Write a structure and sequence with these properties.
The structure is cut from a larger assembly and holds one copy of chain A (about 100 residues), one copy of chain B (about 450 residues), three copies of chain C and one copy of chain D (about 40 residues). Chain A is built from four helices and four strands. Chain A has about 100 residues and is an alpha/beta fold. Chain A has a four-stranded parallel sheet with strand order 2-3-1-4, covered by helices on one side. With about 450 residues, chain B is α/β, with parallel strands linked by helices. Among the domains of chain B are: about 110 residues, OB fold (Dihydrolipoamide Acetyltransferase, E2P) (Beta Barrel), CATH 2.40.50; about 80 residues, Helicase, Ruva Protein, domain 3, CATH 1.10.8. In chain B, about 35% of the residues lie in helices and about 20% in strands. Chain B is built from 14 helices and 16 strands. In chain B, the strands form four sheets. In chain B, strands 5, 6, 7, 8, 9, 10 and 11 form a seven-stranded antiparallel sheet that branches. Chain B has a five-stranded parallel sheet with strand order 4-12-13-3-16. In chain B, strands 1-2 form a two-stranded antiparallel ribbon. Chain C is α/β, with parallel strands linked by helices. In chain C, about 35% of the residues lie in helices and about 25% in strands. In chain C, strands 5, 6, 7, 8, 9, 10, 11 and 12 form an eight-stranded mixed sheet that branches. Chain D is of the alpha+beta class. Chain D has one helix and one strand, in the order βα. The longest helix of chain D has 9 residues. Classes of the chains: A alpha/beta (about 100), B alpha/beta (about 450), C alpha/beta (about 425), D alpha+beta (about 40). Chains in contact: A-E, B-C, B-D, B-E, C-D, C-E, D-F. Chains B and C meet through helix 6, helix 12, helix 13 and helix 14 of B and helix 1, strand 3, strand 7, helix 7 and helix 8 of C. The complex binds phosphothiophosphoric acid-adenylate ester (AGS) (2 copies), adenosine-5'-diphosphate (ADP) and magnesium ion (3 copies). One magnesium ion (MG) binds next to helix 2 of chain E.
């Protein structure tokens, strides 16, 4: 709520897909426009949705899987990142 | 919607911060012990912790017990339920006495569920709805503006239908609820371009709203426990909320509602605001009603019950033995009794003056003294009723003040109980006796 | 042409800033009671008080019901008067308390004054004027729709807004139709074809209505009268249609129901809103409960509670009893039939018995009302019987005397006819002896 | 001299920004042989 | 934070394993013999063997009968059905007193059953009527898609829920209930402003199957087999708005329901949990209710009904010359076992007042508590119990936490007892 | 009453004679233990026959008092 009031767009990083589903349900109840990136995303679809998030300014929250970040992709359009849960490997958070 | 009624002159119990009754405040005069006890019960209700207490108000007629109840209700104010019923109201034909008492008890417990809603408010700039003739596809966009921002929304089918129904135009300031979907026309921003029909019906302009176009607001839904029970009793119970004919709701419904509301309270979803149930003339209730009251006061979801009685020792209805207050000893054992006393001459005089102020009747000093003497002699309520008739008599005389002669005329025209009894005893042959005999002729 | 028992009671017959005239308005005597009823009527007209009770106390044949009817006539037909007998409260469909409350709210009335501007007339022209499109697009746009209406000694052309096209299509109006269009709402309604085209077709199902008079633009003030009971019943009743609730309502006969306090409070809230808006005015009214002795103690207790309601009418009660036990009680002997708790909340007016001259004047005025002629000796004998047996006995005996006189080809009532009727029709006392 | 006023406009057009038929336009804004003969023999 | 009632401090019977009752446990003080008897009754109920057993809690007013009943309910636990009642509650106007008594009898008998729920949920991808005709619906989820054929009732439910392509639904196969949970997330950005509330696409397979254990009563089965009770179809609406009032259920329906329950138990899918019916103030019952209670107790499937009365040598309601020990006719008394409840001395009254004060979060000084105990002994125990809240309110108004003697005296002068009010009347 | 042997609906000689379907009389043949009879029926009776779902070979029952087909 504070981030949306301030005009910042948040990035949710979690560790397991079930938490992705729970978060999706929560933010769907709260009406936030969003897109989700998961492990099962296709390569072309992954790139296209990354470009969509970078270009579109109407989706406030964007959800990632922390483990899938090992293959990095440009996400310069963000303004704040939220770590729902922590990982044992700090380099994964560093690349996130 | 109200008129000048009997207890319209009291706006509360009139107490200090330490529950010490003022000599005269908020419409109440005297009854210092009674007012202090009523304030203690008021604080007990406002605390919201003590459940199912019973309190009795006893005393002679015209001692202010119903006035005390109205003062308690006014001090409670809104948002705290107050259910005023009479003993005669329980005896119904579609419901049992126990069921009617259960519904009356549950009417006094309120449940508040607070919700946060998003509201769009602004002055319309352009509305545009494009619909194909003989086709179901509709496409529309609107531009709603505020003093600091302006934006365009492309609309779905239901929003288009709602705006078409509401007859929204350019010079309209409207509010949109994103959840409910209702459109409220708050007012107009300018005139309608000087068409023929409706020339000058929009002169009452309203200022353009200011701030963020989409702002969050909180909405509180207050519903009594009985309403929830009626809604969940059957599918047609919602109609029964207005029509009546609720039937005898099965006990399982009430138990499940109790459990669900307790869960809501433990979850913070709902706030429970218990209130006060007030029974006028409780001596009319049957002994079965008193037994049910005895048991139902032990429930955790019960309100605080206050009763009024003036019968002294009298026969309890449904039984053949006299009881100390018209009530069985079982109910008296679990109730605290607050007493009321007769009024002095000065208290009667100031009550009469308060009533005259409320009835907008200007009484001269001598007229007020005569009214006070009459009230002490005959009845407080008799003089209270005589005030307005004296005002009307004065108006007939084309005078703006009530003098002694107007009160004398009102006294002559309208009788008290004692004078009527005397006239009946003197002329008993002219009235029908209990044995059904009367003389109609005068010779 | 009909003659009930109170056709001659036209009013209390008081004078402004004065007292009751000896004979006026059909009333003879009862000066004090008439003055008290006059001050009560003034109080009711003031429309500033609620829950005011007066008791008409007196013997039989003393004018109590006549006084209540005089109050009703003096207040006029606009003030809602609700006559009632105490026996009527004992229903079988609902409790007594519900019936009493329904009568209470039937006594309160509401007056709604609405002014509406309307254009009416036969449709003569229907042309939309093209205008430049703000959004371009090479489409055909209309800025106004022109409707020409012709009326009796009047005709005009209107440049209405383009929105009218929907209402015109929905009401399938045409040239020659006479229509009803509200000035501020924008809706239209056709009442039929013009009578000038009734000859164009020999048969046609539609109804041809006469052309409306006056100018096309007419401003009308419509006044409607409703009671709180009417609003409560209308809100508690289904609309009536093809929906399933109305179907089960058709199946199950509508019985009286305990209208909940929530519905009544909603009705009060909407009424208060519209009163504040300036469209509605509240009229308290009078609730007359004759034979209050018949009411039970439960009804009396509920009256005790209901008189304190912030919105309640003026209740007039009448009782011909002395010291009698209150119904539903075993040892409560109270003045009249009213228990002492309710008597403390009301004001009593006495109704005195009559003298020979008053009875004679009443008899002669009643005979005048019944379009009958009586001789002086016959009138004296009739008054003698009225003072001997009963006033109502003679008042009723007037008509059979007239029938006997008419059978004897005579246009006047004579002592012979009076004695013949006396022998034919016995009173209560002579029959009790027999 | 009025500052702001609200106008209303109604238009009929086809998707390729083309106007419709004039008679059809006027009909839509507002909204030979025998077919049955009977005779008793 | 928490509310307090008459029996909020009663947490159980406070009986040890051997059955002897401690002097002060579970919020009880004294009444050792009655607690032991009620523990024996609780063991009998837990045995789940006998039917129709009845006991009577006989004692004077303010002696601890309703508290004992609530303690029995607490000891048995929330699994078992415990139906509270009053003698005045059986005088219904829709159905006769006998039917109400039988319904309460069958409401106190519990049944626990196992049911398998077939559930479908997903985003709608097709709505094709087969032509009142079946509808062919295609449900998609994150793990797969599925196409189903639905009966006309489900089609009517879907039609009245305004379900279109892209909507997410929830069809329960067993009951035929359709809920439109919202619009799919993939269409959230289609329009910038519409009333639709969007939901994510469901996870897992469309066809889900779960096993839930649900507790029902025999009265629930009787009502289910007697009148229509639910549904989103107009047929169900008309069926239930027709014949709305209660009806006198026949013995045949109860016998058939008993046969059904016996079949369920025999298959092992259900277990029976007999419970307790508590009828307080039994003296309000008429002679007919007692007479039918004589026959109802002889039924082979009946709960352990517990009765409470506070009257002695009182005549039975309805009769005019039958003087009975507790307002209960001798025919029913012979069917009952009487548990006598004894008055309280001063020390136990003092301890009860102390514990009640502790429960309501009040602080009472020892001398003030002694005065409260002695005035409860003089007038009434419940009178002393109700004086605590006004005393606390008075103390708070004086900016003082603990209750003092002066506050108690002020509360006594404000609120009176029955004897004092009667004396004032005299 | 009898067993249906024929059911031959006939239309009007001219299409303009009636409205819509323009159904004229229907011819039905019933068989009994003593012989057969060919009946000429109103279109209302044909509608009743269709409502009761009567085919060739079914035993039917027509009341001339009321026009009811069973
Ligand atoms: N003062 C009066 N002047 C003229 N007619 C009168 C007068 N008082 C009574 N009447 C008539 O006398 C008849 C009987 O009187 P009512 O007033 O109708 O009865 P009542 O006096 O109310 O007695 P009860 O209570 O009805 S038995 C009616 O026809 C009245 O119109
Ligand atoms: N032995 C006890 N120990 C603790 N609290 C008790 C004890 N006995 C009674 N109480 C409490 O004191 C109050 C007495 O009420 P009850 O126990 O219902 O007495 P009762 O026998 O039900 O009187 P009746 O018949 O209902 S009028 C209740 O609040 C009880 O919780
Ligand atoms: N203490 C008081 N202060 C102000 N007004 C009072 C007081 N006591 C009584 N009254 C007035 O006198 C009348 C008494 O009415 P009510 O309270 O109904 O009498 P009762 O106590 O017999 O029910 C009321 O109209 C009330 O306005
Ligand atoms: Mg009162
Ligand atoms: Mg009368
Ligand atoms: Mg008890």
């Amino acid at each position: 709520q504070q981030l949306k009031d301030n005009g910042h767009r948040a990035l949710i990083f979690t560790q397991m897909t079930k938490v992705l589903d729970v978060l999706e349900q929560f933010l769907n109840y709260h009406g936030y426009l969003y897109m989700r990136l998961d492990g099962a995303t296709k390569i072309e679809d992954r790139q296209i949705l990354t470009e969509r998030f970078n270009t579109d300014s109407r989706i406030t929250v964007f959800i990632l899987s922390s483990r899938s970040g090992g293959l990095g992709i440009n996400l310069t359009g963000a303004d704040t990142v939220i770590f729902y849960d922590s990982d044992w490997n700090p380099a994964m958070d560093k690349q996130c | 919607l109200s008129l000048i009624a009997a207890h319209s002159h009291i706006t509360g119990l009139g107490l200090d911060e330490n529950l010490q009754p003022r000599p005269t405040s908020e419409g109440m005069v005297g009854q210092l012990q009674a007012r202090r006890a009523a304030g203690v019960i008021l604080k007990m209700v406002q605390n919201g912790t003590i459940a199912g207490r019973a309190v009795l108000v006893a005393g002679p007629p015209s001692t202010g017990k119903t006035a005390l109840a109205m003062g308690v209700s006014q001090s409670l104010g809104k948002d705290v339920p107050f259910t005023a019923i009479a003993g005669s109201e329980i005896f119904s034909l579609e419901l049992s006495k126990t069921e009617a008492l259960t519904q009356a008890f549950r009417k006094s417990i309120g449940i508040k569920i607070k919700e946060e809603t998003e509201l769009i408010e602004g002055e319309v700039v352009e509305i545009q709805i494009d619909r194909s003739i003989t086709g179901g596809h509709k496409q529309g966009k609107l531009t709603i503006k505020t003093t600091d921002m302006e934006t365009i929304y492309e609309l779905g089918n239901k929003m288009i239908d709602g705006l078409t129904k509401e007859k929204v135009l350019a010079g309209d300031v409207i509010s949109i609820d994103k959840a409910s979907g209702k459109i409220t026309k708050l007012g107009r921003s300018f005139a309608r371009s000087r068409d023929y029909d409706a020339m000058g019906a929009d002169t009452r302009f309203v200022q353009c709203p200011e701030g963020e176009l989409q702002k969050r607001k909180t909405v509180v839904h207050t519903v009594s426990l009985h309403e929830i029970d009626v809604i969940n009793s059957r599918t047609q119970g919602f109609l029964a909320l207005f029509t009546g004919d609720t039937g005898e709701i099965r006990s399982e419904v009430r138990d499940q509602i109790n459990t669900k509301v307790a869960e809501w309270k433990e979850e913070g979803k709902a706030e429970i605001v218990p209130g006060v149930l007030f029974i006028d003339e409780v001596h009319m209730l049957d002994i079965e009603c008193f037994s049910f009251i005895n048991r139902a006061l032990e429930d955790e979801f019960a309100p605080i019950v206050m009763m009024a009685t003036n019968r002294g020792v009298s026969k309890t209805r449904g039984t053949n033995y006299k009881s100390p207050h018209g009530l069985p000893l079982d109910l008296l054992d679990r109730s605290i009794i607050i007493t009321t006393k007769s009024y002095n001459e000065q208290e009667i005089k100031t009550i009469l003056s308060i009533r005259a102020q409320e009835e907008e009747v200007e009484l001269s000093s001598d007229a007020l003294d005569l009214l006070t003497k009459t009230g002490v002699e005959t009845s407080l309520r008799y003089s209270s009723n005589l005030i307005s008739v004296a005002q009307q008599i004065a108006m007939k005389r084309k005078n703006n003040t009530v003098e002694v002669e107007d009160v004398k005329r009102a006294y002559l025209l309208f009788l008290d109980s004692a004078r009527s009894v005397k006239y009946v005893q003197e002329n008993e042959s002219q009235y029908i006796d209990d044995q059904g005999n009367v003389q109609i002729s005068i010779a | 042409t009909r003659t009930a028992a109170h056709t001659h009671i036209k009013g209390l017959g008081l004078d402004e800033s004065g007292v009751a005239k000896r004979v006026e308005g059909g009333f003879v005597g009862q000066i004090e009671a008439r003055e008290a009823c006059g001050v009560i009527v003034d109080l009711i007209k003031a429309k500033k008080m609620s829950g005011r009770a007066i008791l008409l106390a007196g013997g039989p044949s003393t004018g109590k019901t006549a006084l209540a009817l005089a109050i009703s006539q003096e207040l006029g037909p606009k003030v809602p008067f609700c006559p009632l007998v105490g026996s009527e409260l004992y229903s079988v469909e609902v409790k007594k308390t519900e019936t009493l409350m329904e009568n209470f709210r039937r006594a309160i009335g509401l007056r709604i004054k609405e002014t509406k501007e309307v254009y009416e007339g036969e449709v003569t022209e229907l042309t939309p004027e093209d205008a430049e499109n703000p959004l371009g697009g090479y489409g055909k746009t209309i800025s106004h729709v022109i409707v020409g209406l012709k009326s009796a000694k009047g005709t005009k052309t209107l440049r209405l807004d383009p929105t009218i096209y929907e209402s015109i299509q929905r009401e399938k109006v045409s040239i020659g139709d006479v229509i009803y269009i509200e000035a501020n709402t924008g809706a239209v309604k056709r009442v039929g074809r013009s009578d000038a085209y009734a000859t164009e077709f020999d048969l046609e199902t539609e109804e041809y209505v006469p052309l409306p008079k006056g100018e096309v633009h007419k401003k009308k003030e419509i006044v409607q009268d409703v009671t709180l009971h009417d609003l409560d019943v209308a809100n508690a009743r289904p609309q009536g249609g093809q929906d399933v609730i109305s179907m089960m309502g058709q199946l199950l006969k509508p019985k009286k129901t305990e209208i909940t306090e929530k519905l009544r409070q909603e009705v009060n809230k909407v009424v208060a809103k519209y009163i504040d808006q300036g469209v509605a005015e509240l009229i308290p009214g009078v609730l007359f409960i004759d034979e209050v002795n018949m009411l039970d103690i439960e009804i009396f207790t509920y009256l005790n509670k209901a008189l304190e309601s912030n919105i309640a009418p003026v209740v007039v009660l009448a009782s011909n009893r002395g010291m009698t036990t209150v119904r539903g009680t075993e040892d409560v002997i109270s003045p009249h039939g009213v228990p002492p708790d309710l008597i403390d909340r009301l004001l009593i007016v006495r109704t005195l018995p009559y003298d020979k001259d008053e009875i004679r004047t009443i008899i002669e005025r009643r005979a005048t009302v019944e379009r009958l002629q009586v001789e002086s000796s016959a009138l004296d004998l009739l008054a003698t019987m009225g003072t001997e047996t009963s006033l109502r006995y003679a008042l009723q005996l007037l008509a059979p005397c007239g029938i006997l006189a008419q059978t004897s080809n005579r246009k006047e009532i004579v002592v012979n006819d009076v004695n013949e009727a006396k022998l034919l029709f016995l009173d209560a006392k002579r029959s009790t002896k027999i | 001299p009025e500052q702001l006023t609200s106008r209303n406009f109604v238009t009929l057009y086809d998707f390729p920004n083309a106007p419709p038929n004039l008679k059809d336009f006027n009909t839509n804004l507002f909204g030979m042989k025998t077919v049955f003969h009977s005779i008793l023999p």
